[PDB]
Symmetry: C3
Subunit: 371 residues, 3 copies
Amino acid sequence: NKITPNLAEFAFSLYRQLAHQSNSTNIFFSPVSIATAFAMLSLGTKADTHDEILEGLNFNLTEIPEAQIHEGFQELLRTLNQPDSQLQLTTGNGLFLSEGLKLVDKFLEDVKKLYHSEAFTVNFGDTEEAKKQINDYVEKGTQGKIVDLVKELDRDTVFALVNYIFFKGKWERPFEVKDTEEEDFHVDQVTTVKVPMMKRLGMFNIQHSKKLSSWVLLMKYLGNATAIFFLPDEGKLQHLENELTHDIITKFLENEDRRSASLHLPKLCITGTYDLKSVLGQLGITKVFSNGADLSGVTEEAPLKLSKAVHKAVLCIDEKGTEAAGAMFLEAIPRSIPPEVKFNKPFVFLMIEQNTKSPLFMGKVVNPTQK
Amino acid sequence: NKITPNLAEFAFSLYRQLAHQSNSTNIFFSPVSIATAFAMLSLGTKADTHDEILEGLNFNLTEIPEAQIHEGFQELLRTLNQPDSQLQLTTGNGLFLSEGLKLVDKFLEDVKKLYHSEAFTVNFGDTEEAKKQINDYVEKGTQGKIVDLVKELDRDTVFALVNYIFFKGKWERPFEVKDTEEEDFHVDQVTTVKVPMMKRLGMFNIQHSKKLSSWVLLMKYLGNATAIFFLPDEGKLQHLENELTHDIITKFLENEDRRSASLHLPKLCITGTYDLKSVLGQLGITKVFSNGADLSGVTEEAPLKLSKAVHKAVLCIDEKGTEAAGAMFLEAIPRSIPPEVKFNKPFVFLMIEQNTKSPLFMGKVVNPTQK
Amino acid sequence: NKITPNLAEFAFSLYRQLAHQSNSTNIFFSPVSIATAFAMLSLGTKADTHDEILEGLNFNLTEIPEAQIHEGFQELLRTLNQPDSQLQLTTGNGLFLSEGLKLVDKFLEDVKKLYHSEAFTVNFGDTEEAKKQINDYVEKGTQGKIVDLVKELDRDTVFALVNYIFFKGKWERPFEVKDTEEEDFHVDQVTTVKVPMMKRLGMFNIQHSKKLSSWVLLMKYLGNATAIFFLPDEGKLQHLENELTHDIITKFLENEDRRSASLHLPKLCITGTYDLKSVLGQLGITKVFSNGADLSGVTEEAPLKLSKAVHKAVLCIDEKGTEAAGAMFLEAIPRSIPPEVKFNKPFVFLMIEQNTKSPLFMGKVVNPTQK
């Protein structure tokens, strides 16, 4: 599929921003769930509003027309719904509509044809019935991996573009369940904690790259899939992160060779939860949340903007295989033109005696509890 | 009042040091409470001891004589005691004396005339009656906003120069109490918490400055007062802080223009508490705590130094207006000439076998609980 | 003793790495306990494996032969076992052997002659009887200061090179027990906590060095010993740490002069606990944990490597004197040649759809609880 390279780079792009944001934290995300939600969103959007997005999903528009893109997506999504039988792989892109919404059909058609979208009809005014209906469609799409994707749901909520992906794949070679031997994880420069560490001896597709100063191990799944890992060298984690490319990835994919090794790889369950707004904004994708937000391509009546862009992604690893899930969530409610200035982020301020123009106090609010 | 510019800059000076000290914390202080305490203190002090201070309250002594300064203070303090009636504004500079103190009258006169000072007579030897008496005079001066300004009170405590300011002012336009809508505060690059966010739509004195890369909103009070706020731009908080000046402030004060806006500004109650010694020291104000400390200008019998320089400042904001308070505290007890070296800050050390001069151990104490 | 300079520098070397690793933490270690363990270990080791070590204990091998080194150690250790009577000083270097171990006698002899080593015979297969036996020999060697040196003990544990040092020395001048006056410790740039601060006025060997921008105080012990302290100047702690040398230390040792001072020095009990592997590795000492690990010089049957290099060092200070203790621990179990790659440190990884080579997920595991 012709679009894959861009996705890869967008995954690297997007990963980078998340680590650039917090070194001291766990990271896991679905580049696909995200980009899809947004390409699938890009349809209701037009002009320079829309352009930002797809140059920010790492696409070169002075090269590929819009048509050739959305085809690629369509193809890929399809591919994933029909794997080998031993490999469980689903994806669903449901679109929940407020009851009483005057739509455009050009949009309506397009997301149904190209993005297998499912439209449902919910009362956002009954917000805690709306939360249920939506957390229903996720907590089954993800087959019960992700449930609480919507914790706060606006009543003024127009619609909600929702996306999910479910993965469950068993290993090429399961691990010894009795050989799962609790061990030390050297967490930071400084600290150490106990994990259920799985150990196995055998012949492994693994190599060191001078370029990435890392060990690159591949673990083929039962079916048509592969997890790739990277043991950075001592103090090379950031150098590694720095240096990842699609083509480097491709090179590794094809390396068929194996060799003897003793491997220790831990049993774990992790989550990444995100409001991406900030993050994405950094990728150039700012207009679509704002009051210059072009959502004409969805409906006439009312003028909207994209409220919160929320991703959540869990992962879980054990001897037999992997459980992995991604899940987008784009809320939109009525845009209001009248310009908006909210001090919902840390800020400064004085207080001045009018007559003599002298500061009584000054300060910076950085948090109101407890400070 | 001719001295205001210097105060402003001292407020910026002093603010800067507090943020330079801890980004990751809340900030609120009264530039006035502080400077006053210290100008009012500068009176008992002489020569190069004294000079440090006022060059450190941001005054140019090769320009303004001492006379012209203390007049300015006197005037200002006065101004503040008699505002518009709708605007509550008090200040008091009480000076608590140990029973049995031989004073100088030149000093005694000066702080009574110029700084409306009130002198009281307390037994520092009965320390927890001394704590009460002083926390009495504050927790009413601040009308019950600040109470625990003295948590640890030396028995060898000679006197205590105390300062307070109380502010209570209602808005130009109160906010909708039913429109106070709990919302998300994006606290750090990383984290998010729920505040009571006040929202109102109307015509606001607000502008963006290229220079400060911030939004500058003014909210006039009932009476003769104005609070100024600053929404830094994305990642401009430090650039903003960097760039603030008196004249820039003045420029904004006069901008009368208003315009349409939707504003979200949160309901909060914050405190800043400080031992300033360190901080101030950085402003050049070091001699006055030390054994070169010139407190002759107060009394003959005994030779003193300034023990702890303590500021505390609370603030509180809601729909109708603002409650804000500042409070200094300068403790002095008997200086002791005999040079002093205290390892009360983190330090290094070895242990050596005398005969062979070999290190048995080495270390750095950085804290004795738990380490 | 000719080797002392190197130890000093190794102590500085090693200290530096520990602070370079975590500013925000307490530091205390025995340069001697460590180096001894390792010189005493170096005996079972040969060639380039062995060389790394002693160039990393700060020795110049293109200058001093191996003979001249191990003599020095022998001499020093001896010296320490027979001090002045008023000064309690012991050291023991016990070596615990698995029952059924075919040894080399060249090694056996050498560590008995040169390093007063004591060999014992333990069943590592009964691991929690092994833990006892070893924590026995430490928690008496250290006369009950250090007890839990072995919290996790491998069953496949071959042997354990163990080292200890016990110190108890009373002051030149005890402090006033009734003059121990709780006070403020300014811990960080930012925070403050209460310590039992000992205070005394008298004549103290103390000086300021332009070079180290610190106060350098010596406190002679009852007997043949001296503790040295360093009050860095404001913000000079790192400059101080930077600049320490053996010769500078020597210069200070000899300064006999005293003078009047008021000193405040706190009552405390601190510990430093370490797995040194990382740290030491940085000093060039990497081969000996690895699969190129040359432990032929110990036994024939089986091929081993050094599993965990563990130091723990407590300290305690009060009016009368000091309790101080160091304790090494080098575990070795069967090396396994077959190359080893363990993701027991934070790492990256993708998951790829084989057919289209597109990233489903990506991530970085940095900790599996809670993330």
